[PDB]
Design an enzyme around this catalytic site. Sequence first.
Site, PDB file in Angstrom:
ATOM      1  N   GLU A  11       0.762  -1.231   0.000  1.00 39.40           N
ATOM      2  CA  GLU A  11       0.000   0.000   0.000  1.00 39.40           C
ATOM      3  C   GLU A  11       0.794   1.282   0.000  1.00 39.40           C
ATOM      4  O   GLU A  11       0.195   2.348  -0.202  1.00 39.40           O
ATOM      5  CB  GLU A  11      -0.923   0.058   1.226  1.00 39.40           C
ATOM      6  CG  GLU A  11      -1.961  -1.062   1.247  1.00 39.40           C
ATOM      7  CD  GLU A  11      -3.065  -0.927   0.278  1.00 39.40           C
ATOM      8  OE1 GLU A  11      -3.153  -0.030  -0.555  1.00 39.40           O
ATOM      9  OE2 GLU A  11      -3.918  -1.908   0.421  1.00 39.40           O
ATOM     10  N   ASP A  20      -6.845   7.536  -5.257  1.00 38.49           N
ATOM     11  CA  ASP A  20      -6.264   6.255  -5.605  1.00 38.49           C
ATOM     12  C   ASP A  20      -6.485   5.884  -7.063  1.00 38.49           C
ATOM     13  O   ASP A  20      -7.081   6.622  -7.884  1.00 38.49           O
ATOM     14  CB  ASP A  20      -6.519   5.110  -4.613  1.00 38.49           C
ATOM     15  CG  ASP A  20      -7.879   4.511  -4.763  1.00 38.49           C
ATOM     16  OD1 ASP A  20      -8.642   4.854  -5.664  1.00 38.49           O
ATOM     17  OD2 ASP A  20      -8.159   3.635  -3.815  1.00 38.49           O
ATOM     18  N   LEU A  32      -8.748   4.212   3.065  1.00 41.41           N
ATOM     19  CA  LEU A  32      -9.706   4.868   2.169  1.00 41.41           C
ATOM     20  C   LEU A  32     -10.470   5.890   2.950  1.00 41.41           C
ATOM     21  O   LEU A  32     -10.990   5.594   4.040  1.00 41.41           O
ATOM     22  CB  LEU A  32     -10.697   3.875   1.460  1.00 41.41           C
ATOM     23  CG  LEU A  32     -12.082   4.480   1.126  1.00 41.41           C
ATOM     24  CD1 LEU A  32     -12.021   5.356  -0.110  1.00 41.41           C
ATOM     25  CD2 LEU A  32     -13.090   3.388   0.847  1.00 41.41           C
ATOM     26  N   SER A 117     -12.576 -19.849  -4.644  1.00 44.18           N
ATOM     27  CA  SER A 117     -11.186 -19.810  -4.173  1.00 44.18           C
ATOM     28  C   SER A 117     -11.058 -20.195  -2.719  1.00 44.18           C
ATOM     29  O   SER A 117     -10.080 -20.823  -2.355  1.00 44.18           O
ATOM     30  CB  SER A 117     -10.558 -18.476  -4.347  1.00 44.18           C
ATOM     31  OG  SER A 117     -10.836 -18.028  -5.663  1.00 44.18           O
TER      32      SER A 117
HETATM   33 CO   LIG Z   1      -7.615  -0.867  -5.694  1.00 47.40          CO
END
Ligand SMILES: [Co+2]
Length: 162
Positions: A11, A20, A32, A117
């Site tokens: 990040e 972003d 965020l 998954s």
């Molecule tokens: Co993203």
Amino acid sequence: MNIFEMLRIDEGLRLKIYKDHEGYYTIGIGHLLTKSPSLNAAKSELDKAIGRNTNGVITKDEAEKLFNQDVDAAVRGILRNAKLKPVYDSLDAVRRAALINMVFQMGETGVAGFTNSLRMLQQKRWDEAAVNLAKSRWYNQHPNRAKRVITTFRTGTWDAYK
Ligand SMILES: [Co+2]
Ligand SMILES: [Cl-]
Ligand SMILES: [Cl-]
């Protein structure tokens, strides 16, 4: 290596408000702020979060504090979720971090949506889970990162990170 160092690598660190890759306001280490266009809105979230008049700029310590909270929150989310807990529990240390990374980036709820998954991970079908993980918007929008994570899942080593 550990989850903290890992997500820091994924990040990066920014002390000033930024947009972003999706055009969303964020700051710190992948925190965020809002998905809204209003830069004022983001400033306000920020001030709310930090507890001070920030004017869109924070301190490194402040950044690391949002990080801890955020890492903490990802785990809780994992432990609360009926679909995520059992997989998490079945994993080893390195792979658990890979799961955290994903929960952190996309949310508990976004991650619980990768039904297939998750099953494959739960059965240790590493190779297939990785093929399955890559067939996503996630991967396509985050090729490099997504590859380190998928790899981690696959190998169960920190190699993608060295
Ligand atoms: Co993203
Ligand atoms: Cl917060
Ligand atoms: Cl990427």
